Design a protein around this ligand. Structure first.
Ligand SMILES: *[C@@H]1O[C@H](CO)[C@@H](O)[C@H](O)[C@H]1NC(C)=O
Ligand SMILES: *[C@@H]1O[C@H](CO)[C@@H](O)[C@H](O)[C@H]1NC(C)=O
Ligand SMILES: *[C@@H]1O[C@H](CO)[C@@H](O)[C@H](O)[C@H]1NC(C)=O
Ligand SMILES: *[C@@H]1O[C@H](CO)[C@@H](O)[C@H](O)[C@H]1NC(C)=O
Ligand SMILES: *[C@@H]1O[C@H](CO)[C@@H](O)[C@H](O)[C@H]1NC(C)=O
Ligand SMILES: *[C@@H]1O[C@H](CO)[C@@H](O)[C@H](O)[C@H]1NC(C)=O
Ligand SMILES: *[C@@H]1O[C@H](CO)[C@@H](O)[C@H](O)[C@H]1NC(C)=O
Ligand SMILES: [Zn+2]
Lengths: 596, 195
C-alpha cells in the first residue's frame, strides 16, 4: 500500500477519537462557564489535560508520513495541521522558562493598580476604574496623571520580560524553519500548490501598505474635524497645525475614538434612532429578540435553529445564587450541539448582539460536514466579518419599520444620516492606523530592524507619522508602552481586525448588488432576498477546504482584499467633511510637542 | 389465530450492535402488518418491491426481521445500491431486494448522560461484504506492509469503535433503531399470510 493510502486510515481514526474528546472538553467548559464552582474547575482541568495530551501523541505519530509523497491537497492540509509542533521544539530548560515568562507577564497585566497621589491608601485598578476616568473625565491633568501612571508603573515591570520573550520565541521560530515570529504569525494567509490562487507570506505587508495608502485621505479629514471640535473643548492645549495628545482620545490606548460623540456630534439638536423605549412599551423579552433574529435569517434563506438551541441554551442571567460569566459567546460543541450564552436585556445593543452571535452560529452550522481539522473559517478575519454584516443590515431604519419598532410616520432626514455615519467612522476608520502601526512595529522588532536601544524612539516617531498622535511627556528607553495592551502582553495577533474591517464591506456590497438595491450603500437591507443568501452560503459551506482567495472570489469576484467598498460606504461623510474643512488645515506636522 | 411475534422485535428492551445484527426467522404463523403502524414518527418507512397497502394480500414462505441500532445520518445507507461505511463493512442489502425498511428515534432509551458505550461498529475491513453477511471477528487491521503480530500500534488498529450516545447530541447523531423486514418465495407452500 502507498503512503497516501496509509495516511487516510490514520486521519479517519484521528477524526473519530478527536470528535469525542473535543465534545467532552467543550461540555466541561460550558458547565463551568454557566456554573462557577471548584468542582467544575476540576472537571475542566481533567478534560483539557486529556485533550492536550491526545493531541500531542497524535502530532508525534503523524510525522512518519513524508509530505512529498501525498498528492491530494486535502490530506495535505490535515497533515500540516497535525504535524506543527511549534513550542515543543525547544529543549526542556527553555520551554519551562517560556511558560513562566508568559504567566508572570500576564499576571503583572491583570493584577495592576495605580495608586493615586497624596492619599496612599486609595488606589485604582483597570477594568472598573482607570477606564472610567479616561472614558468620562474632562480634565486634562487627571487624564495625564492616569495615562502616565499606567505607562510608568505597569510597563517598566514588563520591559525586561519582553526583552527575553522576543529572543526566546525567535529561537523557536527558526527552530520550525521560519525567519522570525512575524512570519510564523503571517503564515495563516499563506497558500501553496493551487494554481492561480497562491498567496505568499510577504505579500501581506505590501497589500496592507497599498490599502492604507488609499484609506489615508478620509482619515486625514476626520482627524482635522476632530482636532477642530476638540481644540474647541480644551481652551488652549492643542495646536491647530499639529498632532493630538495621546491621553485625551477617549480610551487609554486610543484604540477606538467612539468616546468622542458628545464632543464631535454634527447636529446636536437631532437625536439618534433608539428603539429601547418602544421595545419596553410592548412587553418584549429574550425569546422575542431571538425569534426576530431567526426570522430574519430564515427570510434571507438560511435554515432555522435546532431544538437544542432552544432547550439547552441560557439566554437570561440566572440570578439568585448561581454566578456565571456574561460575555456573549457562540458555542459549537460538536456533534450537532449549538448553543449561545449571553446575559441579554431589553436594549437595542442586545438586539444587534443577538444578530451577531446568531450569524456566528449559522456560519458554524454551515461547515458541519467538513472533516474535523477543516472546521473553521477560511482565515482569521472571515468569521467576525460574517458576524458583523448581519448587525450592519439589522440596524437600518427600514428593517426597524418592517418589524414595528419604528413608527411608519418616521421620516429619514439628511441631518441624521451624517450623525450615524460619523458615529460609525469614529469606531471603524479610527482603529485602522492604530492596528497598522502596531503590527508594523512588532514585525520590525521581531525581524531585527529595530535595535534593542531604539524601541520607544522608533515607536513614537511612527506614532507621530502614521496616526498623528503625540505624547505629552518624553519617554526614554525604560518604558514599555506597547506592552500596556491585552494583546501585546498575552501573545495574540492584531492584523485580524484590519482584514475583517476590509472584508465586511466587500461582502456587504456584493450582497447588496445581488439584492437589486438602489441608492446609498449604508441604507441597504438584505432581507427577503434568497439570491444573497445563496451567494453567501456558497462560501459558508467550504470551511478551510479551499484557499481563502477562492472563498473570497466566490462572493465578491476578486482574489485579493480591496478598500474601495469601504470608501463607497463613507462617501456622504467625505463630502460633508470636505465642505466643513474649507477654512482649516488638513494634515499634521511632526514637530510640535506639548512638552516642547 | 396464532399471531406472529412482531412485538418481540419492535419492543425489545435491548437491541443489538450493527456488526452483530440479530436475524429472526418467522414462519408458520399468521402475520398482520397493522400493529406495526401503531408506532408514531416512523422517520423512514420505505418499501422496495412490495406495496405497503396491498401488503395484507400476498403470501410468502419466509419472513426475516433484522435489528440493529445506528446513527441518525446513517439511515440513508440502508437501501439497495448505496456506498459508505455501514453499507460496506457492517450491513449490505442485495440490489434485487424485496422488503421494507423501518426506522425511528430512540433518544429517550439508548442514550445516557456520560456515554452509552455499549454500541459498536466496524470501521476497518480489507474487502466489502457480500449481501446479508456478518463478521464478528476482532483481529488487528494491517494497514501497512509489515506483519502486525497481534499488537495495536503503528499501522495496526482495532477494527471496532464505539458510538458514545449522549442526550444533548443533535438529530443526526442521536440513536435510531432500525428493523428490516425481508420476504422470499421458495419451492415450498407459502405458510405466511395475512388475515
Ligand atoms: C450549579 O451547581 C450546583 C452545585 O454544583 C448545582 O446544585 C446546580 O444544580 C447547578 N445548576 C445547574 C443549572 O445545573
Ligand atoms: C482526496 O480525497 C478525498 C477523500 O477524502 C476524495 O473524495 C477526493 O476525490 C480526493 N481528491 C482527488 C483529486 O481525487
Ligand atoms: C517538530 O517539528 C519539526 C519540523 O516540523 C519536525 O521535524 C520534528 O520531528 C517535530 N518534532 C516532534 C517530535 O514533534
Ligand atoms: C423552519 O424551516 C422550514 C424550512 O425552511 C420552514 O418551512 C419553516 O417555516 C421554518 N419555521 C419553523 C417552524 O421553524
Ligand atoms: C439636507 O439637504 C438640504 C437641501 O440640499 C440642505 O440645505 C441641508 O443642509 C442638508 N442637511 C444636511 C445635514 O446635510
Ligand atoms: C419581507 O416579506 C414579508 C412578506 O412579504 C413582509 O411581511 C416583510 O415586511 C418583508 N420585510 C421587509 C424588510 O421588507
Ligand atoms: C411495547 O410494550 C409496552 C409495555 O406494555 C406496551 O405498552 C406497548 O404498547 C408495546 N408496543 C408495541 C408496539 O407492542
Ligand atoms: Zn462576534
Amino acid at each position: 500500500s502507498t503512503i497516501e493510502e496509509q495516511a487516510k486510515t490514520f486521519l479517519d481514526k484521528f477524526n473519530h477519537e478527536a470528535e469525542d474528546l473535543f465534545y467532552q472538553s467543550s461540555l466541561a467548559s460550558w458547565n463551568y462557564n454557566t456554573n462557577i464552582t471548584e468542582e467544575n474547575v476540576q472537571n475542566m482541568n481533567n478534560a483539557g489535560d486529556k485533550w492536550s495530551a491526545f493531541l500531542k501523541e497524535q502530532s508525534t505519530l503523524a510525522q512518519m508520513y513524508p509530505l512529498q509523497e501525498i498528492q491530494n491537497l486535502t490530506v495535505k492540509l490535515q497533515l500540516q495541521a497535525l504535524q506543527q509542533n511549534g513550542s515543543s521544539v525547544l529543549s526542556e530548560d527553555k520551554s519551562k522558562r517560556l511558560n513562566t515568562i508568559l504567566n508572570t507577564m500576564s499576571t503583572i497585566y491583570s493584577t495592576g493598580k495605580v495608586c493615586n497621589p497624596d492619599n496612599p491608601q486609595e488606589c485604582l485598578l483597570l477594568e472598573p476604574g482607570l477606564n472610567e476616568i479616561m472614558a468620562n473625565s474632562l480634565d486634562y491633568n487627571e487624564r495625564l496623571w492616569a495615562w502616565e501612571s499606567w505607562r510608568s508603573e505597569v510597563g517598566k515591570q514588563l520591559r525586561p520580560l519582553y526583552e527575553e520573550y522576543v529572543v526566546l520565541k525567535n529561537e523557536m521560530a527558526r527552530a520550525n524553519h521560519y525567519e522570525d515570529y512575524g512570519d510564523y504569525w503571517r503564515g495563516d494567509y499563506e497558500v501553496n500548490g493551487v494554481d492561480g490562487y497562491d498567496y505568499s507570506r510577504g505579500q501581506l505587508i505590501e497589500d496592507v501598505e497599498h490599502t492604507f495608502e488609499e484609506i489615508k485621505p478620509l482619515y486625514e479629514h476626520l482627524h482635522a474635524y476632530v482636532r477642530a471640535k476638540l481644540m474647541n473643548a480644551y481652551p488652549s492645549y492643542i495646536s491647530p497645525i499639529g498632532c493630538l495628545p495621546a491621553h485625551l482620545l477617549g480610551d487609554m490606548w486610543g484604540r477606538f475614538w467612539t468616546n468622542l460623540y458628545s464632543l464631535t456630534v454634527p447636529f446636536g439638536q437631532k437625536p439618534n434612532i433608539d428603539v429601547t423605549d418602544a421595545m419596553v412599551d410592548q412587553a418584549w423579552d429574550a425569546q422575542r429578540i431571538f425569534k426576530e433574529a431567526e426570522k430574519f435569517f430564515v427570510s434571507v434563506g438560511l435554515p432555522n435553529m435546532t431544538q437544542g438551541f432552544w432547550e439547552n441554551s441560557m439566554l437570561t442571567d440566572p440570578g439568585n445564587v448561581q454566578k456565571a460569566v456574561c460575555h456573549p459567546t457562540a458555542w459549537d460543541l460538536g456533534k450537532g450541539d449549538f448553543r449561545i450564552l449571553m446575559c441579554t436585556k431589553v436594549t437595542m445593543d442586545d438586539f444587534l448582539t443577538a444578530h451577531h452571535e446568531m450569524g456566528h452560529i449559522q456560519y458554524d452550522m454551515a461547515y458541519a460536514a467538513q472533516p474535523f481539522l477543516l472546521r473553521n473559517g477560511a482565515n482569521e478575519g472571515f468569521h467576525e466579518a460574517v458576524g458583523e454584516i448581519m448587525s450592519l443590515s439589522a440596524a437600518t431604519p427600514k428593517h426597524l419599520k418592517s418589524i414595528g419598532l419604528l413608527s411608519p410616520d418616521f421620516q429619514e432626514d439628511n441631518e441624521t444620516e451624517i450623525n450615524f455615519l460619523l458615529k460609525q467612522a469614529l469606531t471603524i476608520v479610527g482603529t485602522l492606523p492604530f492596528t497598522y502601526m502596531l503590527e508594523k512595529w512588532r514585525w520590525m522588532v521581531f525581524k531585527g530592524e529595530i535595535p534593542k536601544d531604539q524601541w520607544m524612539k522608533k515607536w513614537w516617531e511612527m506614532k507621530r507619522e502614521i496616526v498623528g498622535v503625540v505624547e505629552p511627556v518624553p519617554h526614554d528607553e525604560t518604558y514599555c508602552d506597547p506592552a500596556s495592551l491585552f494583546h501585546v502582553s498575552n501573545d495574540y495577533s492584531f492584523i485580524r481586525y484590519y482584514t475583517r474591517t476590509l472584508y465586511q464591506f466587500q461582502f456587504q456590497e456584493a450582497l447588496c448588488q445581488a439584492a437589486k438595491h438602489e441608492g446609498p450603500l449604508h441604507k441597504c437591507d438584505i432581507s427577503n432576498s434568497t439570491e444573497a443568501g445563496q451567494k453567501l452560503f456558497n462560501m459558508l459551506r467550504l470551511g478551510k477546504s479551499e484557499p481563502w482567495t477562492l472563498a473570497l472570489e466566490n462572493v465578491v469576484g476578486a482574489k485579493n482584499m480591496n478598500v474601495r467598498p469601504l470608501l463607497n460606504y463613507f462617501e456622504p461623510l467625505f463630502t460633508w467633511l470636505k465642505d466643513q474643512n474649507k477654512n482649516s488645515f488638513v494634515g499634521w506636522s511632526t514637530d510640535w510637542s506639548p512638552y516642547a | 389465530t396464532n399471531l406472529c411475534p412482531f412485538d418481540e422485535v419492535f419492543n425489545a428492551t435491548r437491541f443489538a450492535s450493527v456488526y452483530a445484527w440479530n436475524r429472526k426467522r418467522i414462519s408458520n404463523c399468521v402475520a398482520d402488518y397493522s400493529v406495526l403502524y401503531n408506532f408514531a414518527p416512523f422517520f423512514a418507512f420505505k418499501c422496495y418491491g412490495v406495496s405497503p397497502t396491498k401488503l395484507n394480500d400476498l403470501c410468502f414462505t419466509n419472513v426475516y426481521a433484522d435489528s440493529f441500532v445506528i446513527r441518525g445520518n446513517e439511515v440513508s445507507q440502508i437501501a439497495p445500491g448505496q456506498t459508505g461505511n455501514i453499507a460496506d463493512y457492517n450491513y449490505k442489502l442485495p440490489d434485487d431486494f424485496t422488503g421494507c425498511v423501518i426506522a425511528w428515534n430512540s433518544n429517550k432509551l439508548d442514550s445516557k448522560v456520560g456515554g452509552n458505550y455499549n454500541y459498536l461498529y466496524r470501521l476497518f475491513r480489507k474487502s466489502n461484504l457480500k449481501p446479508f453477511e456478518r463478521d464478528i471477528s476482532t483481529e488487528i487491521y494491517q494497514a501497512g506492509n509489515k506483519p502486525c503480530n497481534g499488537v495495536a500500534g503503528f499501522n495496526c488498529y482495532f477494527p471496532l469503535r464505539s458510538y458514545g450516545f449522549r442526550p444533548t447530541y443533535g438529530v443526526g447523531h442521536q440513536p435510531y433503531r432500525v428493523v428490516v423486514l425481508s420476504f422470499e418465495l421458495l419451492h415450498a407452500p407459502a405458510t405466511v399470510c395475512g388475515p
